[PDB]
Amino acid sequence: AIRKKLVIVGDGACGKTCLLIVFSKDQFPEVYVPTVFENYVADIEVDGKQVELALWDTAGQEDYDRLRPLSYPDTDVILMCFSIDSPDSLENIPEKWTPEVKHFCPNVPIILVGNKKDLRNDEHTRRELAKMKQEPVKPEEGRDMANRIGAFGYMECSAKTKDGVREVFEMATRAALQ
C-alpha cells in the first residue's frame, strides 16, 4: 500500500471534525460525539489500488496564522469544507482558504465539499437563515464556487446520516494518486 496524506480545511462551523470522526469510525457515534480528532490512518482500496490515507484536521488552528501552516507539509489531497447551512462559510472560501492552500500546497488537488447537506431541507435551518435574508447553499452555488477556485471537483455529504461520506474519501484517495 502507498502512503498518502489528507488535510481538511474550512471555517470553525464547517463540520470538518465531525466528517473525519464519522469516516474513521464508519458510524455517527450514538453515545458521545468527540470534541476533537487526533489523527487516523485509513486503509482504502479504490479502483484496485491500496492506499494508507493519513487524515488530519485543522480545527483549533483557524485563528493562528503561523501554527496553521505546519499542518500542510507533504499533503497529497486537500478537502476544503463549508457547511450548506452557512452561506457565510462559503464566502470565505475564494479569497481566504483558497490562496492559502494554493501557496502552501502548490499543485495539490482541492476537493470542495459541502457538509451538512441534510440541513438543506430542515425547517428550523430555513427559518433561522431567513432572518438574515439568507437560504441554505444551493447545489449550483457549490459547483460554481468549486469551478471558480480551480477545484479538482465538488462533492456533498452529511456526517449525520453518513450519506456521501465514503464517496468523498474514496475520491480524495483517487485525487491523491493522480
Next chain:
Amino acid sequence: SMEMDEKDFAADSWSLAVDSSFLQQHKKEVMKQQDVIYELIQTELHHVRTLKIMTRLFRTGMLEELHLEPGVVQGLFPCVDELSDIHTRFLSQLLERRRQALCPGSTRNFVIHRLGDLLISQFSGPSAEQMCKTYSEFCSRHSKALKLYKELYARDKRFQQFIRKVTRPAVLKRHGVQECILLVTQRITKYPLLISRILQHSHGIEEERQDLTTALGLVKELLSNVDEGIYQLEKGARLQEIYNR
C-alpha cells in the same frame, strides 16, 4: 502508557467508563460535563504516550543502534525531553484529581467537579512561561525536523531499516516520526475546543464557570504568544534571507 491508566480510559466516554448503576444517579448535565472532562484526560494520556514513543522508541533507539552524526538526533526530536516533563506533570495532576474523586470500593466511579483551578494553575505562572518557550522553540523547528527525517530515510540504509522495524507493529500505525511531530504541534490548539465545551456544561456552580472562563482566556493568551514567536528555521538558510524576512 501504563495498563492501569489505559484501562481507566479504554471506554469511548465517561458514561460508558463508569458502572451503569452509578451513571443512573446523575443528571444529564453532569454526564455531559463529565464526558468532555474524560475526553480532555484521555487525549492528554495519548499525547504523553506520543511523547514517550518519540523519546523512548525513536530517539533512544537511534542513539543506541545507529551511528548518526552528532546533533542529528536532537534535530529530529527538538525539545522532546522538556515537552515530556511539561505534559507528564500535567497528566499526573489530572489523574490524581480523578483518583481522589473515586468512590470508596470503586476504581472507575468518580465525578470531577473542580477542574478549572487545575487548568488556571497549568496555564499561568512559571509552568505557562515554560510551555510558551518550549512550543515557540518546537514549532519553529518543526519543518527542519521533517526535512532532516526525509533526507535520512532516503539516503541511509540502516536508518530506513530502523524506522521500518520499529514502526511495523499495528499499534504504531498512526505514529511514524512525521506523524508524531504534527500530533505534538496540533496538541496545544485542541485545548480551547475542549475547555469551551467543558465550560458549556459547567454553569451549575458559578465559581466553576468563572474558573473555566479564566482558564480559557489564559490558554488563548498562551496560543497567541506561541503563534507570534514562530519563525521556521531552515538548514543552510543564509543571514541575508533571514534579515530580508
